């Protein structure tokens, strides 16, 4: 009945096999199930995001933003409070796979990622951006504070997360929402409120998958 | 028919004050936004400022901040532009507009202006 | 405060040919926040294209537009006489809602 605070420790403890693990809130008893790629890159990560199908609707409030929706073997969102407790605690990179409706994929790779606390509107931090899926950070630099359909916190006089749907670290509204409307293969182009990632597949590209997941800086 | 009247121009000397009003038919001013644009003798259209009548959210140019006003009043279904401490580069053609704030998201109705003065 | 600096600040050309006036952002832009307005004297300005792209109701279709990102672009593809007008990008994202320049469209006959 041990407890890990992420699949780097989960990992480290000899479970190498990919799939859901319950994982636990620092300095708390509180727990969370999040799904663990022990492949890629060499393991050791927790997807905080995952589309592939549309199955699970991403337009929620703050409150499911901050707790984590969907199922962690399929789509989900982790949630707000977990990552920016655990990015808070050590140096995670933040990785980002990709796929469009064409068979192609890409990836983006940050040095350094966190999340500020709920008081600070779990505003995003990035830094030293590497991958084939742009060579300009698709999401907008310095970060923005998060923003759902009951919380407005970008830069827009407009309501980005009502305008473009889901929640995300919008600008006015910025260059990426990987949180928007699932289109499917013949209805993913010139979609303004689709899975956006400017810097790899340009203007209104709806994408077909993404993940996002962490690792510590020091693994490996 | 979508319709915007302004009214309240004329001349005003240096220092001055005067209430520009934007009375809109054919809509309620709540379900959009209200925004003043100017365009001054023989230069470019300069966006002046903007209201969000469903919670009175404002938007000032830099041009204008500390001097201008805008304001609505939902039971009139009016916006208004209160300008005080008036330059003479303020003197223009004022136009108040209807922002679709849903797609197309821009500028799709417009009034027919009204010309301000502001001369000693 | 977002800069849109509009290029060229006039043009003359002859009816039938193709004219591009072209916009460029200081910063990133979500595209459906890009519209283009067209001011004949004395007249109100008139929205053309609305979100970069789509062409708004009333308007011919020799008006196009396009881009994304800092670059947006209006297409006059047939240049009529009537055409004769300032041309304005406005981004309406992030306030204050600063115009373009504006581009003055003169009819060389």
């Known amino acids: 009945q041990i407890s890990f605070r992420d699949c780097a420790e989960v990992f480290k403890s000899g479970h190498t096999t990919n799939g859901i693990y319950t994982l636990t809130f620092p300095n708390s008893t509180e727990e969370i199930k999040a799904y663990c790629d022990m492949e890629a890159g060499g393991g050791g990560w927790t997807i905080i995001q995952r589309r592939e199908d549309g199955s699970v609707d991403f337009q929620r409030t703050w409150k499911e933003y901050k707790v984590g929706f969907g199922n962690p073997s399929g789509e989900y969102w982790l949630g707000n409070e977990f990552v920016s407790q655990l990015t808070n605690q050590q140096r995670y990179v933040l990785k980002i796979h990709l796929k469009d409706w064409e068979g192609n994929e890409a990836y983006s790779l940050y040095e350094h990622f966190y999340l500020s606390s709920e008081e600070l509107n779990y505003r995003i931090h990035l830094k030293g951006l590497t991958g084939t899926a742009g060579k300009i950070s698709s999401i907008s630099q310095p970060g923005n504070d998060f923003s759902t359909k009951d919380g407005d916190n970008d830069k827009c006089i407009c309501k980005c997360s009502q305008m473009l749907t889901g929640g995300w670290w919008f600008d006015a509204c910025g260059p990426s929402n990987l949180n928007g409307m699932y289109y499917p293969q013949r209805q993913n182009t010139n979609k303004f409120n689709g899975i956006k990632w400017y810097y790899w597949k340009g203007s209104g590209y709806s994408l077909k998958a993404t993940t996002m997941m962490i690792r510590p800086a020091d693994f490996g | 028919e979508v319709q915007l009247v302004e009214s309240g121009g004329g001349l005003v000397q240096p220092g001055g004050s005067l209430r520009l009003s934007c009375a809109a038919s054919?809509?309620?001013?709540?379900?959009?936004?209200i925004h003043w644009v100017r365009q001054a003798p023989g230069k470019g259209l300069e966006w002046v400022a903007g209201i969000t009548p469903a919670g009175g959210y404002t938007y000032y140019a830099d041009s204008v901040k500390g001097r201008f006003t805008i304001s609505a009043d939902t039971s009139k279904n009016t916006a208004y532009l209160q300008m005080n401490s008036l330059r003479a580069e303020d003197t223009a053609v004022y136009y108040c507009?209807?922002?679709?704030?849903?797609?197309?998201?821009?500028?799709?109705?417009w009034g027919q202006g009204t010309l301000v003065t502001v001369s000693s | 405060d977002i800069q849109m600096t509009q290029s060229p600040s006039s043009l003359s050309a002859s009816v039938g040919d193709r004219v591009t006036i072209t916009c460029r952002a200081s910063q990133f832009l979500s595209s459906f926040g890009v519209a283009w307005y067209q001011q004949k004297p004395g007249k109100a300005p008139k929205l053309l294209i609305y979100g970069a792209s789509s062409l708004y109701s009333g308007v011919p279709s020799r008006f196009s537009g396009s881009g994304s990102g800092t670059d947006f672009t209006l297409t006059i593809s047939s240049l009529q006489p009537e055409d004769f007008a300032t041309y304005y990008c406005?981004?309406?994202?992030?306030?204050?809602?600063?115009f373009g320049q504006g581009t003055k469209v003169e009819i060389k006959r």
């Open positions: 406005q981004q309406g994202l992030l306030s204050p809602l600063t």
């Open positions: 507009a209807r922002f679709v704030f849903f797609l197309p998201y821009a500028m799709d109705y």
């Open positions: 054919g809509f309620t001013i709540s379900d959009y936004w």
